[model samples]
Target: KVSEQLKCCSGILKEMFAKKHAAYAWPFYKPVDVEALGLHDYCDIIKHPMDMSTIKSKLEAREYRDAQEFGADVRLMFSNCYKYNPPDHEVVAMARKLQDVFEMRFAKMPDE
Candidate 1:
């Protein structure tokens, strides 16, 4: 199932991962973090909806279930990243912005 989701995302992933490396993005990336990891935070541009409750709602989307789980996996693997190994915030920010790029690029892709 995960591989299926990934297959659906391969084209966009290739484009973004191309950019991720061209820009020297480290630690690699995964599909879940694109937006599934935080529909609340993603939706929060208008309202800052990152609280536990709102984020929980983001997890309620069955379409996003695996993404939420996989996002937890990424965060666990990379905790303490900004604490000790502070990469340039802007660089980090730019890599993070790739999230937006993929979101917009693949917004119409399959959910199931």
Candidate 2:
């Protein structure tokens, strides 16, 4: 069933967020504060802003049509981070680490 598949995918994400390497995941736990951060042009650069909290909310609401959709949002979150931050930035390095961890875990999911 599709719902069952989504449940499995959701569990994988939850696990990813809980692991120790995920210390780097803290920066992506919530939405970016554009106003307070003084990133006035943030919205202009990142067309689709994604974060972990938003992904969890969408999963709970079953907003994603499939597991692939969930994966896309996860990638989108990292892509936005890369686009807005410089290669030398700490946040960019963190994002890369978390992104690698996510891909490794996601790739191991059992075939349906």
Candidate 3:
């Protein structure tokens, strides 16, 4: 069932946000503060903004159609980071590591 899949995906998300992964996950917890950061071009560069908080809300509301849709949003969140930040930026590296962990766990999810 879709709910079952969503539950499984939620488990992975929770693991990713666990304390062990906090260094990489914390930055992605909420929407980027573009104005405070003075990144005036962020909105123009990143067409779709995504964050873990939004994903959590969507999951609780069962807004995603399936696990794949959830995964897409996760990827989009990282993609936005990469697009808006410089290649050598620390956050970009953190996002890369976090994304790797996410993909590995996502791939291991059982097929139903």
Candidate 4:
């Protein structure tokens, strides 16, 4: 179960990575374009600070429950950056969306 979700989330991560800076225009305009929608190296979206291989081992060993919780934390690590850029609306919104998806959806294990 955990491994399957891991794969699904892996795909999500890949797609998100591919889309980094993609929301911007062809050139410079509102400074937003040149700045990658203002999310470049925004902390957690571009990378995961926690080690994934360790979590993979836990999942493969059938520690599905705890591993899933840890996985959510890793994916939503951007919430940790909130303290640094607390005044940025877009950043807060982005963090909220990711955190909500993890807590309300994946953490619930809908079909499990």
Q: By TM-score, who's the top model here?
A: 3
Model 1: per-residue lDDT, tens digit, 10-107?
Answer: 45545655744445333334222326544343233322212222223344443344444434433332332333234776645644565556567556
Model 4 compared with the native: what TM-score? 0.40
List the candidate 3 regions with Cα displacement exceeding 4 Å. Answer: none
Candidate 1 pairs with clashing backbones = none
Cα lDDT computed for each candidate against the true fold: 0.43, 0.87, 0.90, 0.45
- Candidate 2, residues 12-100, lDDT tens digits: the string is 77876786866799889899999989999999999899999999999989899887899999999999999999989999999988888
Stretches of candidate 4 exceeding 4 Å from the true structure:
20-67, 94-110
Alpha-carbon shift of residue 44 in model 4 (angstroms) = 17
Give the winner by lDDT: 2 or 4: 2
Candidate 1's C-alpha runs over 4 A off are 1-4, 19-21, 24-88
Query: Which residue pairs does candidate 4 place in steric collision?
Result: none
Number of clashes in every candidate structure? Answer: 0, 0, 0, 0
Q: Rank the candidates by lDDT, best first.
A: 3, 2, 4, 1
TM-score for each predicted model, relative to the true structure: 0.36, 0.90, 0.94, 0.40
Residue by residue across 1-112, what tens digits does model 4's lDDT show? Answer: 6566666555433333344533421121111221655655545443434333443444456554544565554453544445435556565566565445445544444244
**Which number leads on lDDT?**
3
Lowest-scoring 10 consecutive residues by lDDT in candidate 3? 103-112
Question: What range of 10 consecutive residues in model 2 has the weakest lDDT sum?
Answer: 103-112
Residue 56 deviation, candidate 4, in Å?
Answer: 11
